[PDB]
Structures are given as structure tokens and as C-alpha cells.
């Protein structure tokens, strides 16, 4: 989904 590092 969101491609940042969560």
C-alpha cells in the first residue's frame, strides 16, 4: 500500500 518504511 503505502511505500514508505512503516
Amino acid at each position: 500500500g503505502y511505500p514508505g518504511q512503516v
Partner: antibody, heavy 116, light 110 residues
Framework: QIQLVQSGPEVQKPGETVRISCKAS????????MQWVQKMPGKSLKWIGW????????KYAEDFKGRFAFSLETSASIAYLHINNLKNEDTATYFC?????????WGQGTLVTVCS | QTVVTQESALTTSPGETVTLTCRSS?????????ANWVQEKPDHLFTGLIV???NRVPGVPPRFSGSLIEDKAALTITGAQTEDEAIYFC?????????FGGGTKLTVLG
């Protein structure tokens, strides 16, 4: 208990370079990405980009990629923002903020003043 | 090109419910915009409130909630407190960049 502590205000002349630090505590530094945000005086916020703290790979906003760069000192839990060839319009408060998705925890901000 | 629009200012009183909205100039806000809400108090003291449309940041009091209403992202404060007087910014994710709204100055009477 999670805290992001940024370095102090900087004053510079056009054409100079600055390095802003963001020291993280209270979580495993390498497990969540670090974002950077610019707030120009009186105005709203612009995303500069993020850096992945596991892989070191950054992602930049288009307007910032030429003179704004991220780095890590992973062993010290520090993320850095480097601004080169400073312009008058770079005068702003800069924030680091931890993912996510987005901006969960915020540093206190670092004011960079470029003297015109 | 995409612009994110928030109410410039709202006023509430203690114990009221107030809803702030966040509109995209491209069309409807959806869960794929991962809407954030953050709070600014003096001096440039930011805290996270909501990320990912409706996820409340740890430690944020339960009177804050995020949702989607009528194609906008929305922050609802159910039972406003005087300590909620602040500027509230939303941010939306568009595939490859975050875009912030202009902020809402929330006044709390009392």
C-alpha cells in the same frame, strides 16, 4: 518516551551549506523511516522527502532534490539533512518526523536563517 | 498541481464537537491517500494525531478521530478542550509525494 531532538538554529549567508541533525530515542532507529519537512515563515508545510533507515534509500520531493540531501549515522540514531548552496528562500524551520504512514512523531524544529 | 484545502479557521467552545475537513483538488480523498492530521502549538511544536485516515497516534486522547466524509478526510474532536486551541494540518499521499493542506486555526472559547 519516543523523542526526536534536532540541532539548534543556524544562521548562514547565501551560497553556504548547513547540516541539521535529528537524534532519535525510544524506539529501534532502523525500523521506521525518517521524513523531513520545511515550514517557511508564516506559510504551510512542504514535504522534503524520507530516508529508509533500514536500507539507507531516500525518496525526495522534486523541488528539493537538487540541493537537499539526507544521510544517516545509524550507530548514533541520527538522521541528517544537508542543504547546500543556500538561497534566501531556504529560510524556514525544518522538521524531522518519523513514519508512519506519514508523520507520527515530530522533532522540535530547526530554524535556518539565510541572511539576505 | 494537486492542492489540499482545509478551512482557514474555526471556533468552538468547551465540550462541543467540531469537524475539520481536508479536500483534494484531484477528486475524492480515499484510503490510498493515507490522510494525516497533525497539530501545531507555539512555538512550532508539532505532534501527530492521526495517520492512515483513522489511526490515532499512541498517546493522543480518544476525543480525536479521523475518517472520510463525503469525499474529504475529516478530523472530529468530540468534546473540545481549551488545550485543543492550535493549528491543525492535514497531509495526503499522492502515489509518490506528500502534500500538506494550509492548516486550520482552531479557536477554543473559554
Amino acid at each position: 518516551q519516543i523523542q526526536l531532538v534536532q540541532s539548534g538554529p543556524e544562521v548562514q549567508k547565501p551560497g553556504e551549506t548547513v547540516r541539521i541533525s535529528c537524534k532519535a530515542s525510544g524506539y529501534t532507529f532502523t525500523t521506521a523511516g525518517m521524513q523531513w519537512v520545511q515550514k517557511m515563515p508564516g506559510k504551510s508545510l512542504k514535504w522534503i522527502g524520507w530516508i529508509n533507515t533500514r536500507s539507507g534509500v531516500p525518496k525526495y520531493a522534486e523541488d528539493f532534490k537538487g540541493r537537499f540531501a539526507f544521510s544517516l549515522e545509524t550507530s548514533a540514531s541520527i538522521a541528517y539533512l544537508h542543504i547546500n548552496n543556500l538561497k534566501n528562500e531556504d529560510t524556514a524551520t525544518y522538521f524531522c518526523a518519523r513514519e508512519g504512514p506519514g508523520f507520527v512523531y515530530w522533532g522540535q524544529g530547526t530554524l535556518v536563517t539565510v541572511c539576505s | 498541481q494537486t492542492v489540499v484545502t482545509q478551512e482557514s479557521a474555526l471556533t468552538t467552545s468547551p465540550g462541543e464537537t467540531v469537524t475539520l475537513t481536508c479536500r483534494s483538488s484531484t477528486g475524492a480523498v480515499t484510503t490510498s491517500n493515507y490522510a494525516n492530521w497533525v497539530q501545531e502549538k507555539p512555538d512550532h511544536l508539532f505532534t501527530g494525531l492521526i495517520v492512515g485516515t483513522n489511526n490515532r497516534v499512541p498517546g493522543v486522547p480518544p476525543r480525536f478521530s479521523g475518517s472520510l466524509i463525503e469525499d474529504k478526510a475529516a478530523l472530529t474532536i468530540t468534546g473540545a478542550q481549551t488545550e485543543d486551541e492550535a493549528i491543525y494540518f492535514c497531509a495526503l499521499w499522492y502515489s509518490n509525494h506528500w502534500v500538506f493542506g494550509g492548516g486550520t486555526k482552531l479557536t477554543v472559547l473559554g
